[PDB]
Amino acid sequence: RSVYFCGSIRGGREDQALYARIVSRLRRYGKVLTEGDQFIHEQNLNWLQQADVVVAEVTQPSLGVGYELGRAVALGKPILCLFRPQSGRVLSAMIRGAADGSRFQVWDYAEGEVETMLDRYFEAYL
Amino acid sequence: RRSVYFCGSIRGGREDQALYARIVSRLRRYGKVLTEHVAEAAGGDQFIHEQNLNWLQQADVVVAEVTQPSLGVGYELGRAVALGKPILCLFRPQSGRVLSAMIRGAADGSRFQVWDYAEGEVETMLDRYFEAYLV
Ligand SMILES: O=P(O)(O)OC[C@H]1O[C@@H](n2cnc3c(NC4CCCC4)ncnc32)[C@H](O)[C@@H]1O
Ligand SMILES: O=P(O)(O)OC[C@H]1O[C@@H](n2cnc3c(NC4CCCC4)ncnc32)[C@H](O)[C@@H]1O
């Protein structure tokens, strides 16, 4: 399996710690592909096109993460978004509202059980 | 007349709210602005997504002010690219921040354009774009 991971970079780097934890756990389930700007865009689109599953941490607002998710939906890749409501933020209606059965899932989580949540997704929801 | 889809941060932050209202007002000169809302129960967000995607499908051109990072705006732009819609992104360097590489890196001739501009000059930039590519 090939996994494409999305997380804020230029939107802000604050959840770096958990992105690392998420990428580490994702390795158990497949090859994590994402572990000038035109070059970056083309590189990432190529990885997105070849991915079997897309996973995004969507707590920090980010144009690039949103864009990856939009491209991924249209490519028909199954998507898991992970959101932390304890931060006090409310998730974009365009992401929450993109939920679509097995094709697009948005899961709220508490930071301490992110690994448990990923296990559950790959075991029973994919 | 032509239809314009306008994108700008909401849950990403409303720092540029007044600017978005200026943009929507100026865009009305060139067509019907489908998304004036840019200028609730979570269980209603799928309704919003559906409504917005229907509008995005109808749109002749997609205009985004991308200075404020936003998942929704990014998603709108990704969906728009895949639908083949012409796109203008407007960004303010004086914000101090580096625009997402996925947005700047998406530039593609006249089809996807990213325009840096100075605070105060959004109306003249909109006019120049519409005059050149839509009128
Ligand atoms: O940069 P933001 O927050 O807009 O968008 C982040 C998302 O968009 C992709 N991305 C953005 N910039 C990237 C990038 N270049 C950055 C530019 C210098 C530090 C790295 N390299 C790889 N992927 C990138 C990532 O896969 C990430 O999931
Ligand atoms: O809320 P973020 O910043 O992720 O996304 C904003 C973008 O996504 C669309 N959008 C997001 N929330 C919307 C919304 N209502 C939400 C529910 C109450 C306020 C926000 N109504 C219409 N469009 C919305 C807008 O067209 C806008 O361009």
Author numbering:
A (entry chain B): 10 to 44, 61 to 151
B (entry chain A): 9 to 47, 57 to 152
Copy text from the publication.
DNPH1 is a 2’-deoxynucleoside 5’-phosphate N-hydrolase. It hydrolyses dNMP to form a free nucleobase moiety and 2-deoxyribose 5-phosphate. DNPH1 is a potential target for anti-cancer therapies as it is involved in cellular proliferation and is up-regulated in several types of cancer. 6-substituted AMP including some cytokinin derivatives inhibit mammalian DNPH1s, specifically rat and human DNPH1s, with affinity in the micromolar range.
